[PDB]
Amino acid sequence: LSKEILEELQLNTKFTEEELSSWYQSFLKECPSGRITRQEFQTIYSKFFPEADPKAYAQHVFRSFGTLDFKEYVIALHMTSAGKTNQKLEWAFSLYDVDGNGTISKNEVLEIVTAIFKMISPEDTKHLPEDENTPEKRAEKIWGFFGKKDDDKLTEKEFIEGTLANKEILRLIQFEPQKVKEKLK
Amino acid sequence: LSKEILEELQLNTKFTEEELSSWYQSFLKECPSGRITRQEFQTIYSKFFPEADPKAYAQHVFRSFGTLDFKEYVIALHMTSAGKTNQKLEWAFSLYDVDGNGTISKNEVLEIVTAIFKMISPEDTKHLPEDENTPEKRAEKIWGFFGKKDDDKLTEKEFIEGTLANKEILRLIQFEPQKVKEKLK
Amino acid sequence: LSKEILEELQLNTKFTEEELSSWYQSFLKECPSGRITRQEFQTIYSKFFPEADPKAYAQHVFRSFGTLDFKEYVIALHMTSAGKTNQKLEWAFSLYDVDGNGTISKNEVLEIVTAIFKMISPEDTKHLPEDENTPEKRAEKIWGFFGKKDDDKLTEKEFIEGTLANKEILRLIQFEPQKVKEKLK
Amino acid sequence: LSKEILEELQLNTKFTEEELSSWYQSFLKECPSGRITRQEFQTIYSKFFPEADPKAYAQHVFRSFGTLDFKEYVIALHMTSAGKTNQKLEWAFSLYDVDGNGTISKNEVLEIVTAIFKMISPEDTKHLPEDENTPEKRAEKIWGFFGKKDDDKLTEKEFIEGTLANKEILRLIQFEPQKVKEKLK
Numbered sequence A, B, C, D: 001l002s003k004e005i006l007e008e009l010q011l012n013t014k015f016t017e018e019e020l021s022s023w024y025q026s027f028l029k030e031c032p033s034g035r036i037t038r039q040e041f042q043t044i045y046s047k048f049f050p051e052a053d054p055k056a057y058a059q060h061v062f063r064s065f066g067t068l069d070f071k072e073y074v075i076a077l078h079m080t081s082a083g084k085t086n087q088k089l090e091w092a093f094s095l096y097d098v099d100g101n102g103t104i105s106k107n108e109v110l111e112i113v114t115a116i117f118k119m120i121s122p123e124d125t126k127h128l129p130e131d132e133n134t135p136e137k138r139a140e141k142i143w144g145f146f147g148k149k150d151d152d153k154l155t156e157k158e159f160i161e162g163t164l165a166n167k168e169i170l171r172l173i174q175f176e177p178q179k180v181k182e183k184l185k
């Protein structure tokens, strides 16, 4: 588990195996089964993002992985809060492909963008450019950069190419609450 | 020791084993026993932070680990001066849990925040937001973000979740003197 | 391939072997032969840099490596879009030595600088200093910093020494489209 | 050599072993003996820092290591131009201890500060704070932060403690030409 987590994160880790083991011992005192349900997971985001409405967001993050074990729980927290976005592109594809069918549709992008938008304070909201100030505008822009028609599908190959190649695209799909905020101020 | 330090720091290290070995040879010329007392440790902070009152701070850092050996001494200096705060969350919990009982109480947070505040120059002080300009205000805000009642306790699980998840929380518990300063100017 | 890529990038990687393997499976669904032609490669840049004219640029990048296999394709995308420029100096020499003869001539630098310039929007263009606002001015400045006469040749030794030693030089040869942009605003 | 360099730099490297090997092949075409003299080394700095007077600086850097072999040459270029200063503290001590006797005297600090100052353009010079605008002022401030009397000696232990602990000190001893410049603008 600790080496397994460290193995999956590799460059994104903010912990050593010993520290992961300490966190783990603590986690087990709280969740003796070593599993956390979707409801328990959503509560972490509700408790730590008082100003926003993190429910949809936390559910989508949970979904990207019944329950999550400690490994997935630790990775989820790293994906939403630590590291650079360009190091999480594979995972991000999993977040955007809402139904897990392997391709991202326009409706899926809208779904994720809407949930991310709910993480932003209505205050930070008016600091947004006119062309990206609503879920639908932000989602359309994204679809547009990928050169997609409403009917089209986006594969993992194109998704990684575009997000890596063009930083403008990376900035639009960005899902970490803090980074979405710190790109305006 | 050098591999042992390098092993504990892992990603936070600013030295190679050879350089650690050089520093060590130098350290032994000064402290032949290879041990440094609390009083000797406090003197390093007093000597290098002339403008502040580092005593309480240095004592708490020392405590987080009679004497410290070279390994702990090197780690302590890394914890207070190098790397990114999000990579020191496990250690930070040890710093905040003043009595080492495993949970952080409101009084402990106040204790650490007060010591950190003593590291800031009275000059940089008035550059602080109204809601975080005194030890008690800064400590209350922290307790408030964790959703705690004065009577409550904070576990290591919640501490890591909150500090990692919400950067606002990370900024409030930040203990490195330089970062506390460079977040205002 | 995944370990082979990870081996060549080493510090520049934004992916783990597992993620590279996922991207690969996706790539094969699109290109069953596991090879991508110059024309297919150019299309990625045309599709993701709508505002510029990426043809010459994409051709030079392709050339630095008939077809490219997945490994070279992944590295090419990393070279143009991720990491710090100072970590790509060896590769950059390969990009500038247009004919692959081992030395860079003044005409080669002009060729690459012109292609890079085509990646910049005519809008960002007037934000350029007077002495670097045209391909020929930018190329001359570069040649001048290297202390070269129009007739001279630049070896890989001098190229690495100059670009590493003097950041001014590094900034002038910079080839990543985003960095060229973000150095003005 | 390539693994040996990679071993000494470890975290500071901007090259892979293969790239170091390429640079090496190029270096040998220029210096078949694989050795570079002090005069040859100084010429690199003179050629790439046209606006300054890099002689004293290049000599001190050379000295910190007759001739230098490729390994030392590569490390020297990394020390002066790449990475973060806090990762080069052991080496920096070697740079400041001009006579190699193991302790730094006030005259040695003045010597190095003067050489570094010669790397700054007279233009960037007036952008310097009043208390650090001359070699003697900058050197005195440094000695003062270390709490030293003119007669005193500075050991490697204290040097590392102070430079790591107090970023103000790190900024004053900073020796990379670019960083000295980019700390004003």
Ligand SMILES: [Ca+2]
Binding pocket: A096, A097, A098, A099, A100, A101, A102, A103, A104, A105, A108
């Ligand atoms: Ca889907």
Ligand SMILES: [Ca+2]
Binding pocket: B096, B097, B098, B099, B100, B101, B102, B103, B104, B105, B108
């Ligand atoms: Ca306690």
Ligand SMILES: [Ca+2]
Binding pocket: C096, C097, C098, C099, C100, C101, C102, C103, C104, C105, C108
């Ligand atoms: Ca050529």
Ligand SMILES: [Ca+2]
Binding pocket: D096, D097, D098, D099, D100, D101, D102, D103, D104, D105, D108
């Ligand atoms: Ca000396």
